[PDB]
Amino acid sequence: TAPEAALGVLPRADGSARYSHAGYTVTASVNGPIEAQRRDEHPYEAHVDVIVRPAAGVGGTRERHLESILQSSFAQIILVKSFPRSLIQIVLQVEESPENEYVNTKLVQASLNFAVMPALFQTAMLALLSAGVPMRATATATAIALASENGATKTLIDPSPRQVELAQSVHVFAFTSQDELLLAESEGDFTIKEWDAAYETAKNICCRPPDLRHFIRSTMEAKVATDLHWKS
Amino acid sequence: DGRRWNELRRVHAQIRTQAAADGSSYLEMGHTKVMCVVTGPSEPGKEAEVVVSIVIAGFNDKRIIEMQSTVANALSASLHTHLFPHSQITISLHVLSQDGSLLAALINAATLACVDAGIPMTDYVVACTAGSTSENADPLLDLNHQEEQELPWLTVATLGESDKVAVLVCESRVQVSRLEGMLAVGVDGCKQIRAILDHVVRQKGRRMIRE
Amino acid sequence: LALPGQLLGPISKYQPGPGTHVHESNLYSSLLGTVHVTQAELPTISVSAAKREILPEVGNIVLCRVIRITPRQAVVTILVCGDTVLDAEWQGLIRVQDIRATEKDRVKVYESFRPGDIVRAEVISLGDQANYYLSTARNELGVILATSEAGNTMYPVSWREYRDPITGLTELRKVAKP
Amino acid sequence: TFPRGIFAKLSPHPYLLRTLCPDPSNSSSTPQRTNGRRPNEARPFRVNLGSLSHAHGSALVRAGDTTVLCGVRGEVLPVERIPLFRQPDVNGSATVGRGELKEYDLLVPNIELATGSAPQFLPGVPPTALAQTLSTRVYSLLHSTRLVSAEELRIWYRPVQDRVVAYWVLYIDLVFLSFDGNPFDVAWAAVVAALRDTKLPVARWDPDREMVVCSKTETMKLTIKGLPIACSAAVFLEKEEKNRHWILLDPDRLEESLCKEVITMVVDFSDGETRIRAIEKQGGTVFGRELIRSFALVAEDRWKVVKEVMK
Amino acid sequence: MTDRRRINGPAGATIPPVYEDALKIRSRPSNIIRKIYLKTGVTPSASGSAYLELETSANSGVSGLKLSCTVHGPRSLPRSSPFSPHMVVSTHVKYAPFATKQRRGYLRDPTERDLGIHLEAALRGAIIADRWPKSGVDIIISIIEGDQQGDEVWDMMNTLSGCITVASAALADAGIDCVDTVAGGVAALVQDSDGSPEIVVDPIPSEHRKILAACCVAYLPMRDEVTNLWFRGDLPASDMDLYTELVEKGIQASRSANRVLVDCLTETV
Amino acid sequence: RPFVLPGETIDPSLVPTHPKHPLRLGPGLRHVPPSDIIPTVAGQLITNLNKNSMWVEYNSQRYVPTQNDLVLAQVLRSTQDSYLCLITPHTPPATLPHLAFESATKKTRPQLQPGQLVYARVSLANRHMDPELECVNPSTGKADGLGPITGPGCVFEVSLGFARRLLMAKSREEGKVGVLEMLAGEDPSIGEAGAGLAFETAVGRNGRVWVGSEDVKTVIIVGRALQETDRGNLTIEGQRKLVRRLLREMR
Amino acid sequence: MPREVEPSLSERQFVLQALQEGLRLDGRQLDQYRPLSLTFGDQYGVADVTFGKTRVLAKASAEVTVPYADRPLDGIFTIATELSPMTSPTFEVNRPTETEVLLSRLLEKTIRRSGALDTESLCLVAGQKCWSIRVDVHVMSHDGNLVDAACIAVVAALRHFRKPDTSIESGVLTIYTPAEREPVPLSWLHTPFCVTWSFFGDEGEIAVLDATWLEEQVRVGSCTISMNKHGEICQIAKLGGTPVEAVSLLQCTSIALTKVKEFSDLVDKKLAEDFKRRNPG
Amino acid sequence: QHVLLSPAELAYLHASLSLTPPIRPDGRSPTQFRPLIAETGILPGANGSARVCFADGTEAIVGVKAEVEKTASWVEITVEIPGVRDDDSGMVFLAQLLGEALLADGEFVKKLWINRRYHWKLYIDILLISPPLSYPLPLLSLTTHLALLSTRLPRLKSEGDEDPYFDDDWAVAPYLFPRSSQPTTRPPITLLVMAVGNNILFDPSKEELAVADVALAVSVTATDVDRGRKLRLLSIRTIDPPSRLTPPGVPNSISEPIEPIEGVWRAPRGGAKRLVLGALVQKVLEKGGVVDEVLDALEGVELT
Q1: Quick one: G226 exposed, middle or buried, by C-beta within 10 A (0-12, 13-18, 19+)?
Q2: Please, are residues A150 and A169 in contact by the beta-carbon 8 Å criterion?
Q3: Of E151, F190, G162, G244, whose CB is crowded by the most CB atoms within 10 A?
Q4: Do A69 and D282 touch (CB under 8 A)?
Q5: How many inter-chain contacts (B to G, CB under 8 Å) are there?
Q6: Angstrom distance (rounded) from CA E210 to CA E203
Q7: Does G237 touch chain B if contact means CB atoms closer than 8 Å?
Q8: Residue B50 C-alpha, separation from nearest chain G C-alpha, in angstroms
Q9: Which helix or strand (DSSP H or E) is residue A75 part of?
Q10: Rounded to whole angstroms, how far apart are CA atoms E246 and H293?
Q11: GO molecular function: any one (chain E)?
Q12: Cβ of D140 under 8 Å from any chain A Cβ?
């Protein structure tokens, strides 16, 4: 219902974070600018590596897509230029996902999981800020899914996995603090008119005068002030 | 069967078996048979690295690499790895037949292969496989393949006559009480297998110095 | 337009040259190309393909981009060979002693060159390694194009130094006499 | 100095700019990218079908230099082998399974960038990331599109209660001989074309043999639903007055290298109403809400041309 | 065994198609070599390339066998690899997923590697390695279709002849020096209405009732040399004189094959 | 008091439009080409008005080099012109001049064992170039305690912020870190009347802090107190309570 | 990247001397076992075990797959441990590690040899259907006894997991959707547990029960005993080390059982505390 | 495999082999083979086994095990070089060559036939105990031949129309490829023929092979005479002269030499010459040829 997260969960890591919302629990590790294996290394600018670790089973091809998307989006947020040859490592392990009571477990799935994406983008951003990596801006992402059975259209937000299969179409969005779309993905049978309504509904998380912008700030604020208790 | 617990399978060991190798060994414990050929301390085209390769003749990949890792680490403590930094040592072991206690034969045969190569050894490293045989007690020194399925089998490797154990591996369950009697048995076997091994090294040398 | 193996000429009439494999006193072409002849010394024949992908040869001018600058050397991809752009890219390294023969000890990599610049240099020698070796010692050889640390395109002011136009800042680098 | 072609490999990005926004010239000054095709311009699709004899369905898609060869291979999966089989009900006298195609993994796509495809992509190495991410993309779209029906693949016993003895399994494998253009765009259209060409043999179970059997001289055609076709583009930005943004459609390899944001849209016009089956943007702030919507207009135009190519 | 890398089929094993329950000799032997279609430039990005097609029977019945070759220019070798004054030549041949039997791309079947070495042996002789140190030329062939225990070898020989023929074409398009064009060739011995002796320049296995022996040669026209020869038979030593013919017919086949290559390269490029 | 997040430009009013001195810039602030300063990290802004600097303080565990910083480096290997050392694990290796150490000549050079702990002042830090560590300021000709360490010791990890406090002169009082002094027995509150314990401390901006005492027991006590305080910011009283607790466990 | 991080030699000396004196950097005696926190995820079959700074989480999956042709009768049970780049920056995805290979095999044998899981219960249809119970061991942070932490998690995760119920109607098995039918407990006979011992001195003089990472790089060799509370020992693994006299080895096994029992009591209690909250009664 | 040699020494070897009298490094005549020490039955627990040793010191143990399988590949080869992964391409080719010889025999496959719907399968494992110092095909051919000879297949008391049955006592089991005393076939032999210029040489030395102008592997099988033997050629294949993979020689001080000078060794650029290939085959296939000498000695080898 309301997002809940914590920072510094993994002590040894340069930065770590845990996020829980919509029945999705992610714990993420961020490693500061690091020497980069030459095959991975790009000289002029840094290469950000994202590893998505499934809660159960082994990394699927879909899991390879979910990481590629996250890297491209996060690189604009991150300031790749500052550290020339450094490797920024983001590792995410999902501890829990909402169960689908209506189908038995299938370990390997090829489809692109739009439902886990919204939790990861929010999870990583929290961890990266703990790392201190230089960033142009901060971005938040949620996902919207549309169902037609009710007639007209019913908007379902932060969807569950059973919901996306029953739903006619799914759409995931992500916004920078400067309100602009960094990533957008949708699958199903839908119309641009319905999409624009999902974009403006998604826009609400991004601009406020749930409240994602406040959540990240508040979560950071408590740790920041907690860290700065020494100023006294 | 037909073997007293104290008694061990017949052993025939050959040293410098390979006509042209830095070091070689051939060990047969009963029916099990092992051949070892060791490249001398040499540099590939800090402490020295030992590679162990075991090839099972056609008559589980995880079991092999586990055995390879075991022989290497055991030999590595006995071997004076520290003396030559840049050199690499390679142990190639091939098994013609199996009667159980395979690991023990490999570590025994390999240790015989090392002393031939002349690589400095802190001491012979020798191992046997012993079992409890269920409160009646007839602990056994040499385990047949038949006997290992029936009874729990423990493989123990020692630094020669000393009670010290470099390797102890048991993949079959035993109650803690039975263990204390099982290891000492194995330890007693090791000195026997060292004795035959030391005889094999000494007899060849007597002929070599004679020749 | 001879195919590989056309019997170009008897060894007596002409001398072996690039693109020609000579066997049994009958020189033959080794590549599909348009033949040429140079005409004391007999004439030389050659066959040339219509990108040549030529291997760097010592003493040849090369244009190249600096991947990194390091205290003892410079690491530079050899992007182009004179008149032949290289579809195949071979790395090349420039030594501190090689950048400027004058004032050798005073010459430092950081002041001479900077990443992202494009340099013009000869091949001092073959690699003796995976990385070929080059030198910018000759006065003519120097950074031909540069991008400022700010990112602004830099226009040369003096041989030792480059000026960033908007910044007004000046960065020291060897620049080409021509 | 402007040594022709020598300049391009150095300072590539600026060279694209000069040609993109020509200074006042004795020319039309139309924005021409290094490819020679205007931004609104697009690579011309060319599809030829029925090439592969061994495969059940075959289709070759060409977008200039880029090329894709798709083949449809049919295999029969015994109902007993698949885990979790439950006999279907032809008609019912509100619970939905994951899907007959999904739970039984009846369709197995795989996109294979050849080692020959690009200087960039080479053999003897585990699959490259672009090749893997594209494969799942085709899989996801195929199940969301419902392009191939699950019912058509079933095999029925037809007892003189009727029951399903097995499901036809359709393997789709694709190989790029060359890669100089956007990968996905060429592939999906090839997949749809290949599935259309698929002609699985009519199959009947023989009770005495107790084995599923296929009949020579018997031809059935898979019924494809819709003709979803896609168009993909990438933005070029003059940065290394807000920086100028240009949209580049069906990009060439180099353009992919010097452009950091892409968009791919999948749309079907067969129903007569524009329908957007999937959208994807990444790596840039250029593709705002207004740009996204109007890309579908370019997509609609791209859809209209593709149907002429695909008979 | 599910690849973390690639999409996976159903865990249960699939079953191939099963169908419900005498080709005349195609053409004259000497000119029997099937008409071939070779074009350079199939892939531009690579330094060179070529595509070869063959007609299953007579003229243009179907495109039964189709080869696409990709040669990479003299390529900087891996830093860790030992320095070599000789140009490294490496051949990789992968059967496509579309064959009579589905062949996994990952598998790199034993049948496939065997071809790579032969092709590696044929091309290697032709290339002049002394002129390009620290250079690695990578020859890659992807086979679209195959031609069409004992029957397997004969089909394989034909595919080899085409792979060496496309490779010669590929090597030319790239500036890769070649002592001579290397052309593929095939030959075999067949028996027809008690006519055991005759040799056919192109095997065409299915048409022939049984094939006694066959050879595949890679003659370098203009240089009296064979880079690679491999032959399967059960030939009596007393009958060896025919082996000389069979080998000589193979090289006669190669010269014919060379004509296509020379013509395509010679024709407007 | 101002709180910032990445991408939220500092307002112009907070910046001082009195350019008698061009403004030096602290961590977490980046300068765009127009005269706008944009935060690049999450944290709380500090005006530092008396200084001509602004910095936003963020406690992280990984150190990116800054010139004239003091680092606790470890020597990995030797090269002909230089000694190669690592500032922090998995960093790009640093380059230490062979001749940097005080009194050094081409005829007289100190030999530094592989794995020897070294203290160094960062000579140069350029994003484009690998770091370089100097032993002695060239003008003084003196290292001033900067250099290799031979004493019996151990290096303990620390949060960069807790490290900053130690390096700062006012470790006690404004800094709020005085456990080092508490264990020393200078403070009256502890009440142990122990007359103190002898510890040698070398603190570095790299985040790794060296503590050395002749007694093995000394090193662990100081260290655990130091490490426990980093991981959990401690009310000075809590720190007092912890040192006593660590002290009692000692025998 | 350097494949392995090496402790500075000056550090390596302090730990050896501390251990000889009996003092430990951890601040706790040699016999000690670091404090254990076991927390079960709300979802069935997820367990997170934390020792000091090291955390490992284990999740259990049970798909129905086709049996291997070699052994049509037995179902497949796999323990998958993957060292992660989050664990330490060194570890690289898709690349094997020496520790990663051994951890999976040692653990896999401990459950299998004890045989708490039944191969007979796993098979549904002899020909074409078998259960695929699995546990994925995720290493969150690598300090000390990764093996010991994974074992307590694996054994805990397995017991907590519930299989999808199965019922055979008209002689036809039907795997039941979770909504259709309630889940089924794991049919667990007895519980194995694993304990690792580390020796730090030539001749194996010093033995440490739980090893910190820094301690782990210094130690000469180590042995891990896998023991059921009742005393039946499923596995013993002194795969290699500087020679340690047998008498000390045997002594460490009796101590181990005392450590095993206290573990068994916690896990059984912890399973209860959660069960009561979910199903009060 | 892949021996490394200086430019000069390779130059001396090439010329020595070139001289009208073939002055080989070891003084072995073209036909003569190096001493070989072999045993049969070394490997226990197999229907057949063998082991061989060379002057080089390269050695191997090869075992052949068979179980009837319903009438899929009839003969299976496995090679296990110590430092070589199974995936390595060279080994698979080598294994293929060995397999080509046996399967094309016709007699060998015919020997394996038992029933229309049941057939004997021969599983061969070839193991190189010695380090792979030099090219290994020569040893593998003789070893496999010997083991095949030793292979004993149990006698089938089935009338041979019905599903088959076998006898327990192994001695009854007929030897595969029985001795001469019906015409008696010989298990196949696969040997390497080297040629330097016009001269042809056999049992090539590792140091010799590097200078090879041409190299072929010819596989022959014979029908015993119960002018010695009637021989049959089955498989020929070209092993790339390792020569190409060698250092160039700097002439004593012209991108390619206008003329080929004496002291310099340049990797042999061309391929084999047609005239050479046929004669090379002729020598191997000649009656009274080297083949009969080798094969007869191997028949002479003690069995079990």
Answers
A1: buried
A2: no
A3: G244
A4: yes
A5: 95
A6: 11
A7: yes
A8: 13
A9: helix A61-77
A10: 28
A11: RNA binding
A12: yes
